[PDB]
Amino acid sequence: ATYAQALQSVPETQVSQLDNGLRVASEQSSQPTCTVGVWIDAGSRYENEKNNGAGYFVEHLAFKGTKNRPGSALEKEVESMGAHLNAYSTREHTAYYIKALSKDLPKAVELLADIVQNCSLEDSQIEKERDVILQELQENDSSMRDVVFDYLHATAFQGTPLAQSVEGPSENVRKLSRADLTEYVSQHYKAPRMVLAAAGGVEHRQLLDLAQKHFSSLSGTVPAFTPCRFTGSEIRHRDDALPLAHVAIAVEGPGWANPDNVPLQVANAIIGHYDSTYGGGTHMSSTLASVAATRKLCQSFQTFNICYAETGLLGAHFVCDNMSIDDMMFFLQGQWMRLCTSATESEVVRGKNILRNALVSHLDGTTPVCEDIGRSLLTYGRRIPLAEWESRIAEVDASVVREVCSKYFYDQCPAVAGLGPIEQLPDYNRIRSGMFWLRF
């Protein structure tokens, strides 16, 4: 088993398609557990200004009682057989997955059929949930990471649905009524926009039979989004009482398509990640992280690759004190243009290995495998096998990384979002000047 043989030995993801348009897919294994869930193409990207937050609201209400299962009775099932019911709604995806035993798949799918089709939307339950969402919004206000990322989205995609947050404004939260929720679920939770993923010890034919027996009476056989526009801007929520200063700087990246994602991830793998409670410290190959550990510039930093259907954000997010924002902006831009102008071969090899490890280790356990299945059948349109990922990483070299970074980084207007004691944060002109090198 020389790695490549191990990659070939990974079982494939069989994909089917119901008459209603449900893309039933499954990956068979030998584990005695399973994770089955539907991924829907709803989210804030498909939400208008007045509807903003309806997806989060309906996701909240989904588990709190159905039509056939009144209230906690549904929950009474999930705990009775040891299942873990969970959900998450991204800006472009929504999902409700139920961890269960391999022998509980016939029931679990049934529960899923109840959650997405025969929902309740009880008015009194809506009233109880409204204040809960308000308090959750207040809790997220203290989340200086999520707040900064929402600031980045708003200041990068201003004037487009992508700028909208997942939870939506509090005004919409209090305004939203049952009619809007049922209209939203009837318009977005359509069969062609749903994929019933199931990883673990589930046989694909059994999954197909269950889906045909439960998800049959869905929609027959329309929000298709609008191409959003990137607008290099900046938001400075100067608040000196905050202890640290979260900064996020991004550029218009690629989408789920546009294979340039694979080299680009490698570049991010070169920059890497670091925080105070790390290991080697002033020895890690990342020059950014090594310098940060040497001079203690920050408490954290990361490189994200948020990519949507047609566009996406590529950049970094660092958490540091008030007296070191300028230095880390300098070093981060220096690393970006070092990769842009002369990426070398050894760093590219290290990035390839890091990306290989990320993809391989991320896809362990039934939950990440099922999530990958559901997300890939929506974004890529196909569950990309790990062998294809290996080949695509292998094709990446120094010249490819330099070219792709030049395409996406060099002389590009970034979007900046700072929160906290960000007085040191250089003005947007200085950042944009850092986005190009005079020597080169």
Partner 1 sequence: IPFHPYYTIKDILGALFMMLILLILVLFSPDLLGDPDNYTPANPLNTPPHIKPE
Ligand X SMILES: CCCCCCCCCCCCCCCCCC(=O)OC[C@H](COP(=O)([O-])OCC(O)COP(=O)([O-])OC[C@@H](COC(=O)CCCCCCCCCCCCCCCCC)OC(=O)CCCCCCCCCCCCCCCCC)OC(=O)CCCCCCCCCCCCCCCCC
- List active site positions: 59
Among 88, 225, 330, 389, binds ligand X (CB under 6 A): 330
- 32: tokens are 């005695």
* 439, interface contact from ligand X, partner 1, ligand 3PE, none, CB < 5-8 Å by kind: ligand X
| C-alpha closest to that of 347 among 273, 274, 268 | 268
CB of 238 to partner 1, least distance (A): 14
d(CA 361, CA 276): 24
Q: Encoding tokens for residue 388?
A: 């294809």
239 interacts with, out of partner 1, ligand 3PE, ligand X, none, CB within 5 to 8 A per kind = none
- Could you tell me the CA-to-CA distances from 113 to 43, 46, 82 in Å, in that order? 20, 23, 19
Question: 189 with 116: CB under 8 angstroms?
Answer: yes
**Binding partner of residue 426 among ligand 3PE, ligand X, partner 1, none, CB cut-off 5 to 8 Å per kind:** partner 1
Taking residues 409 to 438 in sequence order and writing x for each that binds ligand 3PE by CB under 6 A, - otherwise, the string is ------------------------xx-x-x
DSSP codes, 245-290:
EEEEEEEE---SSSTTHHHHHHHHHHH--EETT-SS-TTSS-HHHH
Rg of the chain over all Cα atoms, to the nearest angstrom? 23
State the binding string over 378-417 for partner 1 (x if CB under 8 A, else -). ----------------------------------------
The residue number whose beta carbon is nearest to ligand X equals 438
Size of the site for ligand X (CB under 6 A): 5
Site residues (CB under 6 A) for ligand X, limited to 90-129? none
Cβ neighbours for 78, distance < 8 A, ≥ 6 positions apart? 84, 85, 98, 111
Using CB under 6 A as the binding rule, whether residue 440 contacts ligand 3PE is answered as no
Q: Is 438 in the site for ligand X (CB under 6 A)?
A: yes
Number of residues that bind ligand 3PE (CB under 6 A): 4
User: Cβ–Cβ contacts within 10 Å for residue 160, how many?
Assistant: 19
Site for ligand X contains 439 (CB under 6 A): yes
Q: How far is the CB of 333 from ligand X (least distance, A)?
A: 7
Q: 104: closest CA among 72, 80, 86, 87?
A: 80
Q: Which of 285, 430, 436, 437 binds partner 1 (CB under 8 A)?
A: 430
Residue 47 class from Cβ within 10 Å (0-12 exposed, 13-18 middle, 19+ buried)?
A: buried
- Three-state DSSP at 96 gives strand
d(CA 339, CA 335): 6
Which stretch, 42-50, 71-79, 93-101, 423-431, contacts partner 1 (CB under 8 A)? Answer: 423-431
Residue 427 interacting with partner 1 (CB under 8 A): yes
For residue 1, state whether it binds ligand 3PE (rule: CB under 6 A). no
CB of 430 to partner 1, least distance (A): 6
* Dihedral angle of Cα 366, 368, 371, 376, to the nearest 10 degrees: -120
Q: Which does 429 bind (CB under 5 to 8 A by kind): ligand X, partner 1, ligand 3PE, none?
A: partner 1
Cβ–Cβ < 8 Å for 377, 23: yes
> Which residues lie below 8 Å from residue 115, measured CB to CB, with a gap of 6+?
62, 63, 66, 74, 96
Does 429 sit near partner 1 (CB under 8 A)? yes
Token digits of residue 173 = 């939260």
Give least dist CB 408 to ligand 3PE, A.
Answer: 18
428 binds ligand X (CB under 6 A): no
Nearer to partner 1, 237 or 430 (CB): 430
How far out from the chain centre does Cα 425 lie? 27
- Among 88, 225, 389, 437, which residue interacts with ligand X (rule: CB under 6 A)? 437
Q: Are 305 and 264 in contact (CB under 8 A)?
A: yes
CA distance 437 to 363: 39
Residue number with the shortest CB distance to ligand 3PE?
Answer: 433
Residue 88 binding: pick among ligand X, ligand 3PE, partner 1, none (C-beta 5-8 Å cut-off by kind): none
When asked if residue 65 is in the footprint of ligand 3PE (CB under 6 A), the reply is no
Q: Which of 316, 195, 308 is nearest to 258 (CA)?
A: 308
Task: Look at residue 427 and give the partner it binds from partner 1, ligand X, ligand 3PE, none, a contact being a CB closer than 5 to 8 Å depending on partner kind.
Answer: partner 1
Q: Of ligand X, partner 1, ligand 3PE, none, which one sits near residue 315, judging by CB under 5 to 8 A according to partner kind?
A: none
Site residues, partner 1 (CB under 8 A): 426-427, 429-430, 433
Site residues, ligand X (CB under 6 A): 330, 433, 437-439
Site residues, ligand 3PE (CB under 6 A): 433-434, 436, 438
